[PDB]
From Swiss-Prot, chains A, B:
Activated by cytochrome b5. One of its GO terms (cellular component) is cytoplasm. It comes from Homo sapiens (Human). GO terms for biological process: aflatoxin metabolic process; alkaloid catabolic process; androgen metabolic process; cholesterol metabolic process; estrogen metabolic process; lipid hydroxylation; lipid metabolic process; long-chain fatty acid biosynthetic process. This is Cytochrome P450 3A4. Expressed in prostate and liver. According to some authors, it is not expressed in brain. According to others, weak levels of expression are measured in some brain locations. Also expressed in epithelium of the small intestine and large intestine, bile duct, nasal mucosa, kidney, adrenal cortex, epithelium of the gastric mucosa with intestinal metaplasia, gallbladder, intercalated ducts of the pancreas, chief cells of the parathyroid and the corpus luteum of the ovary (at protein level). Interacts with PGRMC1; the interaction requires PGRMC1 homodimerization. Keywords: Disease variant, Endoplasmic reticulum, Fatty acid metabolism, Heme, Iron, Lipid biosynthesis, Lipid metabolism, Membrane, Metal-binding, Microsome, Monooxygenase, Oxidoreductase, Steroid biosynthesis, Steroid metabolism, Sterol metabolism, Transmembrane, Transmembrane helix, Ubl conjugation. It is linked to Vitamin D-dependent rickets 3: An autosomal dominant disorder of vitamin D metabolism resulting in early-onset rickets, reduced serum levels of the vitamin D metabolites 25-hydroxyvitamin D and 1,25-dihydroxyvitamin D, and deficient responsiveness to parent and activated forms of vitamin D. Changing residue 305 to F: In allele CYP3A4*12; has an altered testosterone hydroxylase activity. Pathway: Steroid hormone biosynthesis; Cofactor metabolism; retinol metabolism; Steroid metabolism; cholesterol metabolism; Lipid metabolism; fatty acid metabolism. Changing residue 225 to P: In allele CYP3A4*18; exhibits higher turnover numbers for testosterone and chlorpyrifos. The gene is CYP3A4. The lineage of its organism: Eukaryota, Metazoa, Chordata, Craniata, Vertebrata.
Length: 428, 428
């Protein structure tokens, strides 16, 4: 099974028995793909244990997989287990089960449903400023992801269910070499999500908007244990992703103060006298969008986009056998000098309307693409921008003595910083 | 997972944890289905371990699964492992891999390719008579399956490769309760077919008609390790199935002597002076066909026909969820008094042209139905009839003191007799 890429004439690192190429993950997914992208070029292959993974970097080939041949060949991602009842989660579901869930949950982030959330979100931002105004007086370093995650959790519980609360690898290493053990753990009720975290919610969702828009579309319809599984996906997505990217954004503004002031100038221009950010004023701030896009270029929290080839195909002149996991190294593409001038530098001017057109939307894919892209892309941009407006309207951010500069990425599994992002906060 | 049939309102025996209903297999598949068919009626369900199995007995519902909705919903059988390289076997392959193999191997049993085999098969029948003429003088009991299997092996090695040779459960119980262990054994090279039997052939096929018609259609084509896997399927199919049914036929002729004489009378009528059976004279003997069909009714070696439901459907007014193994109890249907008068009695007159029309071809399915039926159905009927003609032309068969009457079926896994079939042979 380890000769599939030698057979197909596809270059790649030499795999070891059983382990495949997993030992190369010692520097993390990001550094591995960046090297592989430089070592072999447009297309290479490797083996996650016994699982062959093909990495494509051709924009036409990427557009073919994510968009053109999604409903037919590349519908589902890499299988993930043990999941239990979470198999019905939309990010985990497959084939016709996914198409039904994606349609049922797609009217949750329409342009109208998001506009109803701006008056609701506008509450915890003041809780966010007032929670940040107390550490301000304390005159000391601040952990951003804590006060951001506390804010982000307040938004996700209310935008989907409406609960108001003031919010104040070790084992997956064996999953990839033992994917045959995944069916074993599914019959033991073993779950990668600890069974006490889910049991805290296997009744809490029954113990309770997105929650409204599910039973209303239940009345070939929606179940109830699956309703809990979608809540878990949304609750995690709105918490961790929003807080993590906001931590990355405030770090870049602190280490690049000129961008922070020019951002504060536009915020006070569209919203004078510290005006409350509305839906229409958020989409007007283009420099805010440029700061958001550039930070997502340097830190695409997903790193990779993956699809399982479900039958033999010959896309863009290359045969791909059945079962191969097609992977797009998003972190590697976002830092390729063959597309980005001085790629390691934070430059929001890449996304100005003077330069936003020299950017392939199949190289810069922080939210994926095609029918399986990030379903909450428009909410996440809105939720973060409403948070950046209300915070930068009141505070400036400076690095501290303990601030990690340059920021070391987590050499581990998911895209996070090694040391938590701490900065000094000053009141305007 | 054990409440799927309570949810759907489908009757069936109460399953035990983990085991499901496998403890009911203590009398064999046949007695279990016969009781279930009487206990619940037209449709029931049970659990092979954790695998839900739905048993249908409605001819329209059976025709819908085997024929009408084969290419779409019920393409593949129950997954079988560990198989190794035998996953590419046509009886084991799935989806588009199977459709390619079924088309590539379908021109092997055409009406013309079989007609070329009659002059070749006509050799070992004389080896069969001469091997039976020696025990004749010995004047003692004879094991039919030995001299039939020796004959059947001579035919299968020459009709497909042309090699001339004078040919003179314990562990699957854990497969069904541990289907999660099947992926484990696939990575250990563990095989339900002992690796020394296959290694005896992983080179013997390379160390060597059906074999011709494979490389000629190779020239999206056919491989080589897969060529060996198809040889193993054919070599077993032509040996065990032919020898086993021939053992059943000669037993029924011995315990019903009037049928044996009336059969010998027609053989000498179409072929006077002990004429060599040709292709056209075999299809003329209708009483020979009636004896073959009736024995296959009492002993359908497959017992069951199974299909895996690959997506949600509502066939003939009944919803069937994704993943359910749809099973047709062939042994149970062949003995249902609601279709057969005095079902336990051997009566070839059921298949006379006066009565062959009061028989539903979706109740009597000894070779399956639809695009996935027995690919070697026409060869097996021809191979057996050429053997029955040449043997009944020279010998009569009487029961012995050690002959098992009534014949006890193997209470185990596959449809065989408990004691081997032994009879006395006399020369005409
Ligand atoms: C900065 C914030 C976020 C980023 C960068 C992000 C990024 C992504 C990416 C790259 C994918 C995979 C796309 C693909 O495979 O083609 C994805 C999928 C997904 N995202 Fe997000 N996401 C963010 C926030 C959110 C939020 C707030 C939600 C709220 C529900 C969410 C829900 C989902 C879901 C359910 C999927 C699975 C899509 C499917 O399987 O149909 N994400 N996201
Ligand atoms: C008395 C003799 C035989 C009987 C009663 C018999 C019966 C059957 C049955 C019931 C099936 C399954 C049909 C279904 O699932 O719908 C089958 C499949 C099959 N049979 Fe036979 N068979 C016999 C002899 C043979 C012979 C001589 C061959 C020679 C190659 C053969 C090759 C196959 C194959 C390859 C399949 C798998 C079909 C597929 O997956 O496409 N059989 N047979
Ligand atoms: O549902 C999951 N996540 C998406 C939900 C939240 C989210 C995150 C980021 C962007 N938008 C939304 C994963 C299981 C999970 C985790 C925490 C809470 C609940 C469930 S499992 C499927 C992934 C696909 C995937 C990957 C990346 C982004 C989106 C979707 N595939 S993955 O390779 O195994 C993997 C490995 C390590 C971390 C994350 C995912
Ligand atoms: O290829 C196999 N057999 C068919 C080949 C010969 C044959 C037999 C009868 C009729 N025509 C042809 C099985 C594996 C095998 C066995 C011996 C040698 C080589 C390979 S494995 C798929 C079966 C489907 C199936 C069942 C019954 C009849 C035809 C096809 N499915 S099964 O439920 O697991 C099972 C369980 C116990 C015994 C047999 C099969």
């Amino acid at each position: 099974s380890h000769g599939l890429f030698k057979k197909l004439g596809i270059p790649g690192p030499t795999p070891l028995p059983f382990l495949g190429n997993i030992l190369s993950y010692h520097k993390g997914f990001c550094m591995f793909d960046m090297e592989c992208h430089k070592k072999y070029g447009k297309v290479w292959g490797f083996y996650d244990g016994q699982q062959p993974v093909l990495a494509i970097t051709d924009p036409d080939m990427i557009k073919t997989v994510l968009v053109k041949e999604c409903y037919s060949v590349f519908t589902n991602r890499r299988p993930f287990g043990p999941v239990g009842f979470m198999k019905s989660a939309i990010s985990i579901a497959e084939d016709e089960e996914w198409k039904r869930l994606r349609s049922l949950l797609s009217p949750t982030f329409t342009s109208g449903k998001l506009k109803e959330m701006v008056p609701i979100i506008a509450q915890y931002g003041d809780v966010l400023v007032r929670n940040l105004r107390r550490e301000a007086e304390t005159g000391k370093p601040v952990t951003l992801k804590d006060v951001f995650g506390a804010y982000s959790m307040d938004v996700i519980t209310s935008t989907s269910f409406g609960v108001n609360i003031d919010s104040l690898d070790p084992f997956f290493l064996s999953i990839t070499v033992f994917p045959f053990l995944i069916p074993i753990l599914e019959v033991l009720n073993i779950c990668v999500f600890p069974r006490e975290v889910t049991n805290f919610l296997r009744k809490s969702v029954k113990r309770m908007d997105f929650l409204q828009l599910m039973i209303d579309s239940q009345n070939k319809a929606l179940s109830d244990l699956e309703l809990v599984a979608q809540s878990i996906i949304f609750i995690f997505a709105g918490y961790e992703t929003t807080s993590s990217v906001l931590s990355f954004i405030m770090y870049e503004l602190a280490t690049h103060p000129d961008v922070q002031q020019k951002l504060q100038e536009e915020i006070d221009a569209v919203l004078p006298n510290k005006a409350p950010p509305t839906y229409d004023t958020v989409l007007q701030m283009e420099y805010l969008d440029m700061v958001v896009n550039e930070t997502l270029r340097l830190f695409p929290i997903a790193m990779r986009l993956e699809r399982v080839c479900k039958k033999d195909v010959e896309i863009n002149g290359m045969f791909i056998p059945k079962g191969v996991v097609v992977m797009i190294p998003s972190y590697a593409l976002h830092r390729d000098p063959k597309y980005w001038t001085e790629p390691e530098k934070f430059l929001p001017e890449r996304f100005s309307k003077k330069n936003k057109d020299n950017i392939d939307p199949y190289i810069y894919t922080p939210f994926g693409s095609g029918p399986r892209n990030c379903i909450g892309m428009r909410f996440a941009l809105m939720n973060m921008k409403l948070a950046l407006i209300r915070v930068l309207q009141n505070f400036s951010f400076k690095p501290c003595k303990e601030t990690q500069i340059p920021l070391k990425l987590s050499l581990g599994g998911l895209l996070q910083p090694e040391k938590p992002v701490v900065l000094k906060v000053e009141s305007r």
